[PDB]
Amino acid sequence: VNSFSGYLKLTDNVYIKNADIVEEAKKVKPTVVVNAANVYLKHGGGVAGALNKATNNAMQVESDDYIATNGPLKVGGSCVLSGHNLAKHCLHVVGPNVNKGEDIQLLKSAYENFNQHEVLLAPLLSAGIFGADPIHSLRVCVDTVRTNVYLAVFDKNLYDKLVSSFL
Ligand SMILES: O=C(N[C@H]1c2cccc(O)c2C[C@H]1C(=O)O)c1cnc2c(c1)CCCN2
Numbered sequence: 001v002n003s004f005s006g007y008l009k010l011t012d013n014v015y016i017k018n019a020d021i022v023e024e025a026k027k028v029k030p031t032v033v034v035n036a037a038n039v040y041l042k043h044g045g046g047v048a049g050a051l052n053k054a055t056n057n058a059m060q061v062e063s064d065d066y067i068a069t070n071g072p073l074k075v076g077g078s079c080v081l082s083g084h085n086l087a088k089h090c091l092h093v094v095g096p097n098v099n100k101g102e103d104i105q106l107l108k109s110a111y112e113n114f115n116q117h118e119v120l121l122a123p124l125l126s127a128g129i130f131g132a133d134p135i136h137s138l139r140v141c142v143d144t145v146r147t148n149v150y151l152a153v154f155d156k157n158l159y160d161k162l163v164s165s166f167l
Pocket of ligand 1: 020021022023034036045046047048050118124125126127128129152153154155158
């Protein structure tokens with residue numbers, strides 16, 4: 001039993017809810033919240049900009065030190081950093097950005113990072129300002145992640161479309 005509330009169950013291990021991931025994180029304080037990161041951990045907009053704003057920019061300060069030490073992530077890769085006031089840990093995962101021409105096949109590699117964590121609160125990778133089809137992202141999630149994932153979808157219209165079209 002865990003504290004996630006109000007989710008629709010899609011499969012054995014994948015759950016989905018129309019929710020603001022920032023507000024969901026503040027309430028649940030999950031072990032892991034996933035950020036929709038870029039390789040530079042520049043959290044300017046989308047999910048990343050919103051999570052960083054909720055940490056009062058502490059996420060960005062920590063991220064800048066990480067990059068100065070380690071260099072950029074790979075598209076499809078991840079790193080574990082602090083969850084600040086939102087979660088124990090933040091898993092920063094880089095899905096491909098279609099608006100940069102990145103190979104959508106890398107989306108499966110991106111979701112594989114979730115399998116290193118037993119339970120996660122996450123957005124749909126490569127959705128939103130990353131330019132991929134969220135229906136496709138949900139399909140890759142279900143077909144790749146084997147650990148327990150609680151997906152937060154900000155847009156109610158998109159949420160209803162994702163549920164109604166789910167196979
Ligand atoms: O862009 C947002 N989400 C989308 C997003 C962003 C970045 C990467 C992604 O793969 C996605 C999928 C989108 C979604 O999940 O629908 C977003 C933007 N601003 C916000 C919030 C969410 C929630 C807190 C308040 N401010």
